[PDB]
């Protein structure tokens, strides 16, 4: 499933027109990206949380070259899947259908 196919699906479930479904998906996405960029967290119950995390200085092998190199600290985005999402994927809880 890609964005288009997601948007198709969401259009049927929303009984919306498609443009509308497209604004929804773009602006959910956009909003989350924006909060985490600020370093804020987005917690969605039954889904998971999006957060910014900080990578400490580390060291890397440069694979094109072989040359080892030290990596300056970086902020990254990340998602922790919530208990209900895990439960369903794993087989523990049933999906409501």
Q: Are 71 and 58 in contact (CB under 8 A)?
A: yes
Minimum CB separation of residue 83 from a second copy in Å reads 11
Question: Which one, of 61, 93, 52, 56, lies nearest residue 74 by Cα?
Answer: 56
Cβ atoms 51, 41 nearer than 8 A: yes
Which residues are at the interface with a second copy (CB under 8 A)? Answer: 1-3, 6, 9-10, 13-14, 20-21, 23-25, 27-29, 31-37, 40-48, 52, 74-79, 81, 85-86, 88-91, 95
Q: Considering beta carbons, is residue 13 or 66 the nearer one to a second copy? A: 13
* Nearest CB to a second copy, comparing residues 13 and 64: 13
Minimum gap (Å) between residue 50 Cβ and a second copy? 8
The label of the residue with tokens 């929303």 reads: 14
Distance of alpha carbon 37 from alpha carbon 50, whole angstroms: 10
Residue 51's nearest CA partner among 64, 35, 65 is 35
- Taking the least distance from each CB to a second copy, the nearer of 64 and 94 is 94
Residue 69 vs 76, nearer CB to a second copy:
76
């Amino acid at each position: 499933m890609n964005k288009a196919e997601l948007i198709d699906v969401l259009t049927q479930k929303l009984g919306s027109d498609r443009r509308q479904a497209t604004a929804a998906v773009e602006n959910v996405v956009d909003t989350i990206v924006r909060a985490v960029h600020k370093g804020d967290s987005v917690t969605i119950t039954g889904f998971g949380v999006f957060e910014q995390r900080r990578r400490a200085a580390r060291v890397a092998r440069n694979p094109r070259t072989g040359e080892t190199v030290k990596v300056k600290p970086t902020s990254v985005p990340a998602f922790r899947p919530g208990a209900q999402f895990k439960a369903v994927v794993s087989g523990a809880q049933r999906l409501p259908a």
